């Protein structure tokens, strides 16, 4: 830590000691059902874009690796979470949004996006956690004579808020004379068809889009990845895993009075202080394992290779590895004498260390 080979007389702050964890804890709620991703990705027909349907998924074990076997897609396009870590962590609800669009407007399904579908049919929020799966469906969603079972909306009087449906069919008016249910001058029908044909280009093919909207750990978790729970051990330095969040620390019994809608406790540095066990209704503190600073008291290397070690701010019972307890921690390797000399190496609150002849050894004194 000095980046040299010969050190001088003094006290040097070298490093920090920490207690390493011995075990590992995984705690997930006991759910046995399987999430029905198989019936979402296959259907005879999906819904139209203006009347997109949303399926709620909850209280089941979700395996996200079987989604690839259900549809031939490339773009597993995700924003706030990686596609490869969806089994290691858990949510409170999953919402699957199903519709069939044109291939040219797949890029409009993104947070902070505008256009026609993104403004008048299906709008995504700015803080969107969750992700999009889109695949080509020219085999099932096309006809040589044209496909007129899929509708979209041209324009609206105002923009459309995120996660909102408007299925009502009223004739638009852009003037003073009322339409009165007649599509005459300045009056148009709002919904018109894609009109799919197999002879269209690659940008005008039908695309099937499923949007999985994930809401994070603000509630008791219901949708969980496939992982095995472990027995809970307390008063030990472990590596816990409570509903997808990792960490290292010591779990103890808690006296905090959680309200029944609360399951997490947070400290002023926005770190987790208390947790609720997902299996049994139990509140546990999270206190980090033992740590501190280590100072090395030495004479010169041309005098001796003997050193003393000061563990700062801790008792000698707390340290894992002549022992004297000062007010600056406690000191191992130097004996305490009932004599008083002038200060040679300053240790702490009125204690100094020296290399004396009473064989030469390192002594500590007031």
């Amino acid at each position: 830590t000095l980046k040299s080979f010969t050190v001088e007389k003094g006290i040097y702050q070298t490093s920090n000691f920490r207690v390493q964890p011995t075990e590992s804890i995984v705690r997930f709620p006991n759910i046995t059902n399987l999430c029905p991703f198989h019936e979402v990705f296959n259907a005879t027909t999906f819904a139209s874009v203006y009347a997109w349907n949303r399926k709620r998924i909850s209280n089941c074990v979700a395996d996200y690796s079987v989604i690839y076997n259900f549809a031939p897609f490339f773009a597993f396009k995700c924003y706030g979470v990686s596609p490869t870590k969806l089994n290691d962590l858990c949510f409170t609800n999953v919402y699957a949004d199903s519709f069939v669009i044109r291939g040219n407007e797949v890029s409009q399904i993104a947070p902070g996006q505008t256009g026609n579908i993104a403004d008048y049919n299906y709008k995504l929020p700015d803080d969107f956690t969750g992700c999009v799966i889109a695949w080509n469906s020219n085999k099932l969603d096309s006809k040589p004579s044209g496909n007129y079972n899929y509708l979209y909306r041209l324009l609206r009087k105002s923009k459309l808020k995120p996660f909102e449906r408007d299925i009502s069919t009223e004739i638009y008016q852009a003037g003073n004379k009322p339409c009165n249910g007649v599509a005459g001058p300045n009056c148009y029908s709002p919904l018109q068809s894609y009109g799919f044909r197999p002879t269209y280009g690659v940008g005008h093919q039908p695309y099937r889009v499923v949007v999985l909207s994930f809401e994070l750990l603000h509630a008791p978790a219901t949708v969980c990845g496939p992982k095995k729970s472990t027995n809970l051990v307390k008063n030990k330095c472990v590596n816990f895993n409570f509903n997808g969040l990792t960490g290292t620390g010591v779990l103890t019994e808690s006296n905090k009075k959680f309200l029944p809608f609360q399951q997490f406790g947070r400290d002023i540095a926005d770190t987790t202080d208390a947790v609720r066990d997902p299996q049994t209704l139990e509140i546990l503190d999270i206190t980090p394992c033992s740590f501190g600073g280590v100072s090395v008291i030495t004479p010169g290397t041309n005098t001796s290779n003997q050193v003393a070690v000061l563990y700062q701010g801790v008792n000698c019972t707390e340290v894992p590895v002549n022992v004297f307890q000062t007010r600056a921690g406690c000191l191992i390797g130097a004996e305490y004498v009932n004599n008083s000399y002038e200060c040679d190496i300053p240790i702490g609150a009125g204690i100094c260390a020296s290399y004396q002849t009473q064989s030469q050894s390192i002594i500590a004194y007031t």
């Binding site: 949303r54 709620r56 929020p125 803080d127 995120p162 909102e164 449906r165 009502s168 809608f261 609360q262």
Partner: protein
């Protein structure tokens, strides 16, 4: 129905998150009812729909089951899906359909293609009941509290934080508001939410016991 105007008296503070904080001062920015606001008092002895202006604070100091249910929407006479909450002594039914609301919708003590239907535990249980309705990002959030009340003339003095009760993925357009009355004399307070910044105090037991505005008076800006 009879109208009166009264002061809010630092009511309408709710928990903004499901996170336990103890003995701390926390600053949040959300749709809150401002302190000492001008809320309105309705005596329904008799009725168009009330506006839903970026959230609604609702208060009722009566008893029994004379008050139940709400209607949210933007064109309640069909041709648009609307949100309906109906209460009883056992069950809460929450439905999002097109419906056929009349000019005076009410429930007798003695409807189209739709998706969302919900069955839940009763929302309802000297008894002042406070509700906060919010509609953010396609989610309808309902907070509530029940407290003992001494005088029924005005809203009480002090703080009573509103715990979060139901979050729903409704996803409709809500502009107007209607209250259902059970018919075999009911008075209620209505106020409107505004996007303000609050400074809240969590005591040693994790309960919000005090809160300060940030644009009421210059002393509140100084405390911010």
């Amino acid at each position: 129905r009879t109208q009166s105007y009264t002061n809010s008296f630092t009511r309408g503070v709710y928990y903004p998150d499901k996170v336990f904080r103890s003995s701390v001062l926390h600053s949040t920015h959300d749709l809150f009812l401002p302190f000492f606001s001008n809320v309105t008092w309705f005596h329904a002895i008799h009725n168009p729909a009330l506006p839903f202006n970026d959230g609604v604070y609702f208060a009722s100091t009566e008893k029994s089951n004379i008050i139940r249910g709400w209607i949210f929407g933007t064109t309640l006479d069909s041709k648009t899906q609307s949100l309906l909450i109906v209460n009883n002594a056992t069950n809460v039914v929450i439905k999002v359909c097109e419906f056929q609301f009349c000019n005076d919708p009410f429930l007798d003590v003695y409807a189209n293609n739709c998706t969302f239907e919900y069955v839940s535990q009763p929302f309802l249980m000297k008894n002042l009941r406070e509700f906060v309705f919010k509609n953010i990002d396609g989610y309808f959030k309902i907070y509530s509290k029940h407290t003992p009340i001494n005088l029924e003339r005005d809203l009480p003095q002090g703080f009573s934080a509103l715990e979060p009760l139901v979050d729903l993925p409704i996803g409709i357009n809500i502009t107007r508001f209607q209250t259902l009355l059970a018919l075999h004399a009911a008075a209620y307070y209505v106020g409107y939410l505004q996007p303000r910044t609050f400074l809240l105090k969590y005591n040693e037991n994790g309960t919000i016991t005090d809160a300060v505005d940030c644009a009421l008076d210059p002393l509140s800006e100084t405390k911010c």
